[PDB]
Design a protein around this nucleic acid. Structure first.
Lengths: 124, 305, 145, 125, 192
RNA sequence: AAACUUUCAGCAACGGAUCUCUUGGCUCUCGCAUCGAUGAAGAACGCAGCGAAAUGCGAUACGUAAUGUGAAUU
RNA sequence: UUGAGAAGCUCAGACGAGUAGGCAGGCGUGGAGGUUUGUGACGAAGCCUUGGGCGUGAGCCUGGGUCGAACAGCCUCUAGUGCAGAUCUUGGUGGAAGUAGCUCUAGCGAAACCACAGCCUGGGGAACGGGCCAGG
RNA sequence: AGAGCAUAGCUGUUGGGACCCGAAAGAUGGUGAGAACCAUCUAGUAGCUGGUUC
RNA sequence: UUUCAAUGGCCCGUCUUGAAACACGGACCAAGGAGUCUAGCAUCUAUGCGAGUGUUUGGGUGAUGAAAACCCAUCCGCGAA
RNA sequence: AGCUAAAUAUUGGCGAGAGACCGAUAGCGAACAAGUAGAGUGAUCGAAAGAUGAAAAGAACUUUGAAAAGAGAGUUAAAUAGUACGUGAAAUUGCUGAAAGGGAAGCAUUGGAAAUCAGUCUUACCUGGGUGAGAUCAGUAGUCUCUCGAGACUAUGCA
């Protein structure tokens, strides 16, 4: 069950490129006369449930693992039985001291870390 | 301070600032008139009022080597770890430049430039799980005399540990401002000639050890016709590595009437000496000759090199 | 202080600034464009000529309402003017930058205007920030190998 | 926990009281701990700082520096110590202020009032 | 008991639960799988067994419903042998006539805990670089101090000054090879 | 080509959002009862430190006496 | 066979426009009770970024840069809780324009207006036109 | 052979400024010199206009 | 990501009317900005008790925060007889 | 004809303690100078405006300029904190670099080119012998805590 994405482009809000005051976060058009709501030809696509991805491969990174947010060594040890299904992702606000402790622990557990090189240097 | 009104307190600041400028201007204008009337006063003010600089107000340390030759210092060096290079033996330095494990092409683009800087230097890709001490003891049997390991992480070289073979001192530097020839404005092409070496501003005794180590990487006799010079300059404990191609020409500003022109060849970078170890490098079991403390470096006027 | 340009490294450059100057931003922008890249001695002669109406500053982007002159044929454009307030400020800044280079020990016969920029000061009229960097003309050392 | 309703635990009111205190209150606000020898000899844990008091700096960059208290700057909650200064651009030494709680008193400037104060806080002279 | 316990902890609030996008987790120490499940809950199952690692040794922790009200004596443990074949036999004989799902889960945790101890020992023998944290304040300071040092170094001025100085001192032979006729003649008239 | 125009990026301006702060407001509750012809509230003019577009004071003019605290004011 | 968050797991078949309107499930914000023996000067929050990833989406996670003191996940409670429009309010800043002005000049120096571009002939039935179609 | 009472939530609905905004009332009390101007009742209003946020 | 090539592709929101069109609003950006609170009534659901039901007008009480929580004498509202 | 406490009311006054409140376009008009500056003959109307840093250590000195200021320096952990001072968004402006240019345009789909980026590594597993090692092994001796044996250790031997 390799990972298949029905779509890789994001859904940008209509007229978000024309106007800087209009953000690109998707907003469902409400105008009846608007051609985007009527889904004419050549217009931008809209989020539909048909675009949803496979339940088995949902939330899975391109390497087949699911990102599990980790904030300390207690969170890494949780993935002892799920190292083939989940990858550890250290939070952004975890200091470089705790990041080191997390990374050594994850290495013994056989757990992939998504951002294991952040905020640290190497010295062999 | 006293005024917690923003508008009033900056009105008061502008008033005081204007008052300060006026009195300073009046004192300067009257000082100019008297110094014009008597040029000796201008001589006294210029001689006495020399602007201060961090170099001038650098904190005192007794480790600074005096310009007068010292017999104790020479007695130490004459049978030192680098003695085979500075004696009549004249051991030709053979360099072995390597990298860390699983390095990217960004490290190779800088390693190649470092290979251009040093003739008679060999590059070997790091394989498997061979350690620095194992490389050093293996290279000591291959005729090499100095080992350079470029540490890189996430496609960026950031450190350099140089080991004097077979059991000489090990130095560890952290690199910065790494730039290659293509990134340097008005760069040049480096030929195969042996570059000259310039070593500046290594006053302290710890500087002598580092200056000797960097000197030992270069062939003793340079090829003058190539007109290539490699400079390692220490300023405020920062070592700047530059390579230039020079040509003597006439400069009117200089008192001698002569002054060369420079054209950079690359690579250019800066080093900070983090640690010196006695013997082959070993971050765990090594013997620390010098270890930089970042707390002590907070003083702008305190230097070790 | 930091300028817009990566040059001004101490060895072969000299800087000069003027902030919140009481001169129009658009006129200063045009003068800066013309004198950019010129030799320092050549720029001084050109600025003197504009004061004496011998040479005209070609108003180039903000050329609306600017009358064309034959003196703009040198620059490849038509519209031109003779500002004196902008020129006076630029002449003073160039004099400062030349004096700064003399203190730095730079070679005085190779100085060219590497970077001159004009930025809008806060609306007090439209004042102007002006910064100038003059650097030595970098020559190429022959390989001879 | 506090139980009296005559004392407020409001941060707004506690900060207002500290930063708007008169000089009589500020005298007690800037108190310093006595040294161990003085603590067991005067039976007093801490005292308000006074001029000519011999103190040792315990915290900060000037930790370990000794000297007399040359002036008690009450308007800023600071102490001025002898020869504990900082060099200025023009060479004049600008005195450095140290909080009274960051110093320890090693010798008291005893007078009649201080001796009565000592025996007032259960202290043998 | 257990069904009432699960209806509270499993569906209202458990301090051990970590909510995840695809599956909830349990930060309880005695959970065999580490997931929030009805069968995985050590709180909601009065007869529970798990394998835990204590300073390099693996133990089989078991609790029965008859010690539920005595938290200090609730869990009992036996030391599992270092022989993996015998460790499986000890789990089988200590969990005799327990449901096969629970014996299955303890044998799975024994494998993963045995693998983790193996990998930990292999990392100890191996040599790996130490991870040096990057300090933002130190990086900012050394970046600004370096800029001032480079400006104060005057590299090209000092390089040119040294090159001319050693030209006057005649570190070369009689006539230099890095100079031409006019420069050498000018130098000879000046230095002599 | 060049110019101009346009797009993107870097730097520099401009601007003052966001975040964090807070001796302020707002709201509720609790205790209390005290202006003046013995000249009040309010206004004006002075005083001396000042930054007053603030404060204190009244020719005894940042107040004097008394009770203190006990060595500053800045 | 372990696949009992029975609120789970599993098997099968069919179907999929949508205004008004109706009904479910979710995302985000300020504060509160509980909790994570939670994150943080070895760098919280914010901000920037042609770095990477997750979700159909609202959104979320993360690398680097900047930065300097606080902040978040989960269960529940609460509400001054989500903007492109209101000839909206306040502030900032544009093109007009260095124009009107007080040949070329010297200084000073606006305002109205502004969805957005802008070469024509025919047709596009509701103007079609400037914006579509077929041409020059 | 009673099925209600209480609380909470939801929805609808009727009042309160009552989703927001947009026309002048009128009256009371003053200021200045018929008219003008000021402040409160007063969130007196728009059968409508414009807007109304994942 | 920038750009190019091939194909397609109108400016949104409001109002209008059969949909339109047309006429309105929109120079740009940031921040602010509109179904809220309360008193009744009815419906549905949940919860407690049930021929009953509802402590908080008030009293008791609360040693540590005491505007909370806890307890209930006599009435009374609705329901039922 | 007359007096009369208590229970009751209380946006003012003299104080006090709080808060599921607001967090500088908010909350009083007013966090600062605030009923102030300012506007009006007058009645009245009435703002905008908070944050350098731990410490002014608030940039000595040299130099250019008539000056404002600039440049060399210097202080600081930081000046990407210099009083136009925490953070510093967008609109907008200038310079530099690259690319595209002929009028609906931006935009959507698919790839090319250029630039750039991401993660995925063989390393372990199995097996055999040798050498030593040690306990969860002793045809082994003790202590401690729990409920015979279960954990923790202490000696002694390494079959």
């Amino acid at each position: 069950v390799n990972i298949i994405k029905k779509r890789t482009k994001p859904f940008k809000r209509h007229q978000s490129d024309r106007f800087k005051r209009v953000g690109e976060s998707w907003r469902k058009p409400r105008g009846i006369d608007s051609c985007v709501r009527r889904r004419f030809r050549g217009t931008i696509s809209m989020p539909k449930i048909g675009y949803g991805n496979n339940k088995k491969t949902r939330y899975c990174m391109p390497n087949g693992l699911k990102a599990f947010l980790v904030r300390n060594v207690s969170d890494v040890e949780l993935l002892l039985m799920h190292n083939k299904t989940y990858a550890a992702e250290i939070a952004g606000n975890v200091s470089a001291r705790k990041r080191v402790e997390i990374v050594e622990k994850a290495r013994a557990l056989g757990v992939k870390v998504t951002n294991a090189g952040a905020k640290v240097r190497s010295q062999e | 301070g006293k005024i917690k009104n923003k508008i009033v307190r900056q009105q008061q600041y502008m008033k005081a600032l204007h008052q300060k400028n006026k009195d300073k201007l009046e004192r300067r204008k009257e000082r100019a008139k008297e110094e014009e009337k008597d040029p000796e006063k201008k001589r006294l003010r210029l001689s006495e009022n020399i602007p201060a600089t961090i170099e001038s107000k650098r904190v005192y340390d007794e480790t600074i080597i005096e310009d007068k030759p010292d017999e104790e210092l020479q007695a130490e060096l004459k049978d030192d770890e680098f003695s085979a290079y500075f004696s009549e033996e004249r051991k030709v330095p053979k360099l072995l430049v390597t990298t860390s494990k699983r390095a990217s092409r960004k490290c190779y683009d800088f390693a190649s430039e470092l290979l251009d800087c040093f003739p008679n230097a060999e590059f070997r890709k790091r394989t498997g799980d061979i350690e620095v001490h194992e490389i050093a003891e293996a290279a000591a049997k291959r005729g090499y005399t100095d080992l350079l390991v470029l540490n890189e992480d996430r496609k960026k070289t950031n450190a350099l540990t140089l080991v004097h073979l077979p059991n000489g001192p090990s130095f560890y530097f952290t690199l910065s401002n790494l730039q290659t020839a293509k990134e340097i404005s008005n760069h040049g092409r480096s030929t195969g000639h042996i570059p000259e070496l310039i070593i500046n501003n290594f006053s302290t005794r710890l500087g002598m050890t580092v200056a000797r180590a960097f000197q030992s990487l270069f062939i003793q006799t340079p090829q003058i016709q190539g007109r290539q010079v490699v400079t390692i300059h220490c300023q405020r404990d920062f070592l700047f590595f530059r390579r230039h191609r020079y040509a003597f020409r006439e400069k009117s500003n200089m008192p001698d009437g002569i002054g060369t022109g420079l054209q950079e060849l690359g690579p250019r970078f800066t080093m900070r000496l983090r640690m010196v170890q006695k013997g082959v490098w070993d971050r765990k079991e090594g013997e620390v000759f010098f270890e930089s403390n970042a707390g002590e470096e907070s003083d702008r006027r305190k230097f070790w090199l | 202080v930091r300028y817009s340009a990566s040059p001004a490294l101490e060895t072969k450059c000299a800087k000069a600034r003027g902030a919140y100057l009481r001169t129009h931003f658009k006129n200063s922008r045009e003068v800066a464009f013309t004198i950019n890249g010129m030799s320092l001695k050549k720029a001084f002669i050109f600025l003197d000529n504009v004061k004496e109406h011998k040479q005209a500053v070609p108003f180039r982007r903000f050329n609306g309402g600017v009358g064309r002159t034959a003196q703009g044929k040198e620059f490849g454009v038509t519209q031109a003017r003779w500002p004196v307030k902008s020129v006076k400020f630029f002449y003073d800044l160039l004099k400062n930058a030349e004096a700064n280079a003399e203190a730095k020990g730079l070679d005085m016969d190779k100085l060219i205007i590497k970077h001159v920029q004009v930025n809008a000061a806060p609306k007090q009229s439209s004042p102007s920030h002006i910064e100038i960097i003059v650097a030595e003309e970098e020559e190429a050392v022959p390989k001879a190998n | 926990m506090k139980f009296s309703r005559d004392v407020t635990s409001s941060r707004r009111k506690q900060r207002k009281a500290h930063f708007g205190a008169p000089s009589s209150v500020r005298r007690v606000l800037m108190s310093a701990p006595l040294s161990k020898e003085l603590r067991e000899q005067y039976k007093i844990r801490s005292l308000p700082v006074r001029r000519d008091d011999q103190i040792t700096v315990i915290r900060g960059s000037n930790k370990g520096r000794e000297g007399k208290i040359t002036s008690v700057y009450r308007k800023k909650f600071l102490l001025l110590i002898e020869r504990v200064t900082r060099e200025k651009a023009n060479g004049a030494s600008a005195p450095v202020g140290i909080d009274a709680s960051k110093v320890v008193i090693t010798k008291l400037h005893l007078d009649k009032d201080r001796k009565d104060l000592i025996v007032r806080k259960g202290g043998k002279v | 008991q257990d069904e009432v316990i699960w209806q509270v902890v499993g569906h209202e609030f458990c301090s051990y639960r970590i909510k995840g996008e695809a599956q909830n987790f349990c930060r309880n120490e005695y959970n065999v799988t580490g997931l929030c499940n009805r069968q995985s809950c050590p709180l909601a199952n009065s007869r529970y067994a798990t394998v835990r690692e204590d300073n390099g040794k693996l133990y089989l922790y078991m609790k029965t419903i008859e010690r539920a009200h005595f938290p200090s004596k609730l869990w009992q443990r036996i030391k599992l042998s270092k022989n993996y074949a015998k460790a499986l036999e000890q789990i089988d004989q200590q969990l005799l006539y327990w449901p096969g799902r629970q014996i299955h889960r303890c044998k799975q945790r024994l494998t993963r805990l045995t693998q983790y101890l193996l990998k930990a020992r292999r990392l100890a023998l191996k040599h790996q670089p130490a991870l040096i944290p990057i300090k933002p304040k130190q990086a900012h300071r050394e970046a600004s101090r370096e800029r001032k040092a480079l400006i104060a170094a005057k590299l090209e001025k000092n390089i040119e000054k040294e090159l001319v100085k050693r030209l006057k001192s005649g570190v070369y032979g009689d006539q230099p090879l890095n100079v031409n006729e006019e420069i050498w003649n000018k130098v000879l008239a000046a230095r002599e």
